[PDB]
Amino acid sequence: AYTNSFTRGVYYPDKVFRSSVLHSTQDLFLPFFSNVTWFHAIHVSGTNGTKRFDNPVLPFNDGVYFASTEKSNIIRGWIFGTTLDSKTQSLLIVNNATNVVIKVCEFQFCNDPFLGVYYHKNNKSWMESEFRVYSSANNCTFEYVSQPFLMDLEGKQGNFKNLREFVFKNIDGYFKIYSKHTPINLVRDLPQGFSALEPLVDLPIGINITRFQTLLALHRSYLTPGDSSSGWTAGAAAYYVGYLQPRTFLLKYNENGTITDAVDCALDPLSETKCTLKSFTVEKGIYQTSNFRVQPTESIVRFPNITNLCPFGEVFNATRFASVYAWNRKRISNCVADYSVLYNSASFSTFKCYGVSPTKLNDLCFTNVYADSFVIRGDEVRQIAPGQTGKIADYNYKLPDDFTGCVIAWNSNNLDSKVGGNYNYLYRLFRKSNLKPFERDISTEIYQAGSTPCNGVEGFNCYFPLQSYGFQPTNGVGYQPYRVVVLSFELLHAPATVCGPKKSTNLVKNKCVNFNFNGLTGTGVLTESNKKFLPFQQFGRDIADTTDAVRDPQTLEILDITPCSFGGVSVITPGTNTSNQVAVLYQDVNCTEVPVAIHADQLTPTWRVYSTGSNVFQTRAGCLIGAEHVNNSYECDIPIGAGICASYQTQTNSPRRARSVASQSIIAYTMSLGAENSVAYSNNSIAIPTNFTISVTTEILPVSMTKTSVDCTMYICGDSTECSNLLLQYGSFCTQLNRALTGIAVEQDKNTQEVFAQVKQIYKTPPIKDFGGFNFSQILPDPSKPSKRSFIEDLLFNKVTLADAGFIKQYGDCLGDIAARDLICAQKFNGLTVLPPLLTDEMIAQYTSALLAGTITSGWTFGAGAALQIPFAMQMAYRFNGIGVTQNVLYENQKLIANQFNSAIGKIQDSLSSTASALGKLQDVVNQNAQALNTLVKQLSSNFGAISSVLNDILSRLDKVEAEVQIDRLITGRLQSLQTYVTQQLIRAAEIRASANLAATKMSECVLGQSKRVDFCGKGYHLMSFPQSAPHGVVFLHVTYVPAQEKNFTTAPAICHDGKAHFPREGVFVSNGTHWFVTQRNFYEPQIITTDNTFVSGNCDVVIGIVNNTVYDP
C-alpha cells in the first residue's frame, strides 16, 4: 500500500510573523504526490524478522513525515536513535496521554513495546503491566514533560474521524517538531485538501537519527472467540511514512494570518510558474521559469592520480631551526598534504590562517607551498601578521598584501634552553633600509652608503644591526623562544599538486552532478572534450574564468564541463481559471538528455515526459514536450518562437481543450498571418466602391502615472539618529535622487496639462441638440453625475480598477486610519508618498468635454483660435472634402452616416465595457508602478549580509562601534536598491513622456483638425477624432472612412476625341462595360464625359490604356 503524499507534509519553517505573502524558501521536505509506505498490520512477513511486531523499525533518512488515524486513541509514541539500545544513546519519546515524556536515555532494545513479557505478576503478560517497554534507564541524559498530543480530542468537537500529521526533523541537533490535527471521513485513501504544520518544541538532542519505529501497547482483540490468546494484533494501528528532501516551496496565508493554500516551488513546470511569479493564478501566455538540479552530494571527487602523504612532521618534529632573521624556506610539492593530523595534535601555540578559512584544509589541492622555518621572541608573535611592522617585520621578514597561508608559533624553551641561556638566535636592528616582502637578506650592514642623509655621514659609533637573541631558561616569559613557521600557499598558478589527505572516487557522465577537480569544486554534466588540448593546459576557461573543459588528474582525459544540460525552461499555459496543465519547452536544446526533470526524469509515474511517444516536438527554438505539432496554421496567442505557437482557442478535441491543451495535449503550430487571396491585377481596370463602411476605432493611451516620492531617509533611515549620522556621510544621494523624483514627477504633470491645456477657453454643450441626426448622448457628459462626467468615461472608470487593485485596499492597512479620501492608491506606511494630480479627474474631463464641444460646434477653430459657428452637417461635409468626398454624398447620405456614427459609438461602449483589459497599456503602467512600489517595499526586508534587516535591531542590540559596519553595509545596499528603483521610474518617465508627446500630438492633430496621416489615428480616411481620458490615460474615438461594395471598371486615362487626348480633371475615365464615364477612386459617380469634367493635354496615341470616346465642351 504505497500512496501519493497528495499535499501532506508542508509546515511552518520559522516563526517569523507575516501575513498573506508568497515567500519562497527551501528545507527538508517530503515530496508531494509521492509514495508513502503504509504500515498497517501483522500480516505475514510483516512480523517475520521481528517478534510478531507489526510496524517495523524504519530508516530515518534525514527526515520523516508521520501520520496516523483512528476511531479512538490508539497510536502511542515513538523511539528514535542510532540503534535503540543501551550500547548507543536512544530517544524514547512517549505520549503518556497524561503528558508527553521525551527522554534520550539508553534503553535496552524492545522488540515490542507490548511484548508478552512481564515480571511482577502471573507470567503471561498484559496491560496489567506497568509500561514494560521501559527496559532500563542507565546513563539517561535528558528528560522532558509537556501536554499530550491528544488524537481523539481533535475529533471530539465534531464527532468525526481524525488524523495527526507529523514532521520530525533534527537540524543542527535541534529536534524540531511540527504538528497538526484534522478530521477525516475517508480512511481508505489520503484526503485531498490542505493543511499546515506548526512547530511544537525544538530539542537540541544531537543524535544522528537513522532508525526509528512507532510504539503501541497491545491489549487484546475479538476476531476469534477462544481465549486471551485471541489477543490478536491484527487490527492494530496503521500509518504512513515518507522522508524529507531539500526542495523549494511557496506558502500563503488568509485574512486571519493563517495558511490556506500553497504552490510548490519544486513540483511541476506548471507549479514553478506559480512559484517564481509568486502567484496562485498564472495567466495565459509564455512564461519562463527557473531551471533545476539534483541533490548536493558527492565523494572526495577527483584528486590527482597522485596519492602519497607529505612529510609535514619533519618541519614539526625538528629540533634544529633558525633565528628570526634566518627565516628559512622549505619546499613542499608533489605529495599529498594533511592538515588534520597537522591541525589536531596539541603541539602548536599559534595557528592562524590568512585569507584562508581553516576547515576544508584536507580537501585543498595546492600548486605549491613554502615552509618558513625560524625561531622568534615570544612577544613578537603578535607582530607576525600583515599590517604589523617592527624590527622582525620591517627588518627581518615582510609579508605581501595578498594571501599567505598560516601562522604557526610555539614556545621552544624545552629545546632552545641551556641553563646558561641561549644567545644563539638573532635579528637585525633598524638602520633605515626599509625593504619589501620576502627578502632573504643576510648581508652584513657594517658600513652604510655614506651619502645618505640619515646614515653613513651621520654620527655613528660601534653599531651593528645584527642583534643577538639572549635567551635564559631562568628569565621568565614573554621573551621565551617561539619557533615559528610561515605557511604561504600558491594556488591556481599551475595544476594543483599537493592535496589534503582525502581519497577521491570515480566519475559519472551526462548527469547533473557536482564535482571537485583538484579543489575545483564545480557542477554540471560531463561531456567528452572534443578539443585537441595542449598538454601544459589543465583547465580551459574559454572566456572569463569559464573553465569550460577539464582534464581529470587521475585518468588524464579531457572533459567539457557542460553546465548540466543548460537551456531555458519556459511554460505554455492558458492560465489558471482556464486550467492547470503546462507544455514544457527547452530553449535550443534537443530533447536528448532528460526531456524534463524535477531532479530526474521518470518513465511511468506523474513525471511521464518522453522524448518519443510523449508530446515531443522539435523546433529551431529547441525541443518541446507537452506540444504535439499539427499541420494547420492559425494566429498566435501564447508565443514560442519562429511563428511556432502553442495557442489554439477552439480545438476539435472535446474533453480538455483548455486553450493550449487539446484533450490532454498541448498543440503545436505556426502563426497563420491571415487569409490568402490574389487580387486580379490588370493593366486596364479598377473596382471603385459603390458604397462604404466607415469605422470608428479605440485608440487607448495612458497619459500619466503616480507622482510618488519617498523620504529616502525615513524609508531607509526610519528616523534613527546614528542612522542619519551614517546617512549624511554619504550625503546628497538621497537629495540627488529625490530631486530626480521631483523633476520627473512635476514633469509628468507638465506632460498632462500639456496634453490638456491646448485651448484658451472652456465650452459647454448647447442646450438644444439638433446636430444633423448624429447622437452624442453617451460620449457626452450628463449632469446626473458629479460635474457632468460622460457616460463613456464613467464606464472607463468602472472598467478599470479605479482603486488600481486598491492600493488603498489590498492587504488592508491601518484600517479606516489616516488613509485619507478613499480614491487614489499607494498603501502609505512609512518613507513613501504619492501626490494626487494637479488636475483632478473632473477638470481633466471637462477639458476633454470642451475639446469635444469645440470640435463639434466650431470644428477647426475653438483651439486654433476663436470658435466659429458651423452646421456640423457642412462641417462634416468639409471633412469629407478632407478625406476627399464631396459634400454631395453626405448631403444625400446624411442619415445613414449619422446612424453608422451613433451605432459605432454604441459598439464602442459595448467593447470597452464588455471587453475586460481592453485598456492594456493603462493598467500596464498601473501594474508597473504597482510592482515597483511594492518591491521597494519588500526591499526593507533584505538583511544584506547584516545580522538583521531592520535598522532598529541592528542599531539597538549592538554597541555602536561594531554596529557601524553592519549599519553601513545595510545603508549601502538599501540605498543602492532605491537608487535602482529610482532609475527604473526614470525609464518609465522617458518612455511615458514619449507616449505623452505622442498622445498630445494625437489629440492636437486629429482633433483640432482632421488627421490626414495614414494609420496615425486609426485605419482609414480620417474625418474627426475624440478624447476619452483615463485616470492616468486617454482613449480616442477616430472618425475614419472605409469604402466598400466594389465592382469592376475598365479604364482609360485619356479620351481620344477630335484628334485630342482628353483626360479627366478629377479622377479616372470609367465604363460600365459599354458607357464611358468619369468617377473618382473612392466611389462610382459616373459622369458624362464633358470638357467640364475632363481636360485635354498631350496626345492619345503613344501610350497604352486609352479608349476612344467623345467629350462635351461648355
Curated annotation (Swiss-Prot):
Outcome of mutating K391N: In strain: Beta/B.1.351, Omicron/BA.1, Omicron/BA.2, Omicron/BA.2.12.1, Omicron/BA.2.75, Omicron/BA.4, Omicron/BA.5, Omicron/BQ.1.1, Omicron/XBB.1.5, Omicron/EG.5.1; May enhance affinity to human ACE2 receptor
Region (Immunodominant HLA epitope recognized by the CD8+): 422-430
Region (Disordered): 41-54, 116-138, 147-159, 220-236, 293-309, 429-464, 493-515, 595-614, 647-661, 802-827
Subcellular localization, as worded in the UniProt entry: Virion membrane; Host endoplasmic reticulum-Golgi intermediate compartment membrane; Host cell membrane
Misc. remarks from the entry: Variant D614G has become the most prevalent circulating sequence in the global pandemic since April 2020. The mutation is associated with higher viral loads produced in cell culture and animal models. It would not change pathogenicity nor neutralization properties vs vaccination. May be prevalent because the mutation increases virus transmission in human population.
Effect of substituting N738K: In strain: Omicron/BA.1, Omicron/BA.2, Omicron/BA.2.12.1, Omicron/BA.2.75, Omicron/BA.4, Omicron/BA.5, Omicron/BQ.1.1, Omicron/XBB.1.5, Omicron/EG.5.1
Any Gene Ontology CC annotation: host cell endoplasmic reticulum-Golgi intermediate compartment membrane
Outcome recorded upon mutating D379N: In strain: Omicron/BA.2, Omicron/BA.2.12.1, Omicron/BA.2.75, Omicron/BA.4, Omicron/BA.5, Omicron/BQ.1.1, Omicron/XBB.1.5, Omicron/EG.5.1; complete loss of interaction with host integrins
Membrane topology, record value: Single-pass type I membrane protein
Region Heptad repeat 1: start-end pairs: 894-944
Consequence the record notes for mutating K418T: In strain: Omicron/BQ.1.1
Annotated stretches, region: Receptor-binding domain (RBD): 293-515
Name of the protein in question: Spike glycoprotein
Outcome when changing A41V: In strain: Eta/B.1.525, Omicron/BA.1
Record note on what altering L426R does: In strain: Delta/B.1.617.2, Epsilon/B.1.427/B.1.429, Kappa/B.1.617.1, Lambda/C.37, 19B/501Y, Omicron/BA.4, Omicron/BA.5, Omicron/BQ.1.1; Contributes to cellular immunity evasion and increases infectivity
Example of a GO MF term: host cell surface receptor binding
